[PDB]
Amino acid sequence: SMSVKKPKRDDSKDLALCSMILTEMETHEDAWPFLLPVNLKLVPGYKKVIKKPMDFSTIREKLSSGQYPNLETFALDVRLVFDNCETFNEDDSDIGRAGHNMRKYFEKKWTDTFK
Template sequence: IEYPMDLFTINSKLENNQYTSLKEFEKDIRLIFCNCYTYNDIKSKEYCSGKILESIFNEKWNE
């Protein structure tokens, strides 16, 4: 994975006010999904869970 990202890092960036825009936050969240699909086999539970979580994120993000 060329650009790793995880929820701990995102939380830390939020706590330290390192995001200057919502777009930056969204980019990091989407990077997690991208890395999930790159690293895990399409038939794995991790890949499928990533798809479900991404769907929920998209729904909430677009509200």
């Protein structure tokens, strides 16, 4: 509260570390459904159904331009990618399986890096 602060957790490497994680996600073989924004002109239903589209390119641009105020808003966008994937794709489809795998991959790097 006012003039009463918890000890300073060192956040000075967060930007670099989120960039590294993102690089690892970008280079994973199952990243292909997630690398670019879904083409809303060519994919029926996507626009109306998925209220907040998100993809790795968009996260990378946001990261590169200071649009994440902290590492939690970064994780929120990554998880949005997989949440959207689960919303639109059957679990037993290549894209659906890709999304479960990438989520697992991410969540391990996240825990290992920060927790």
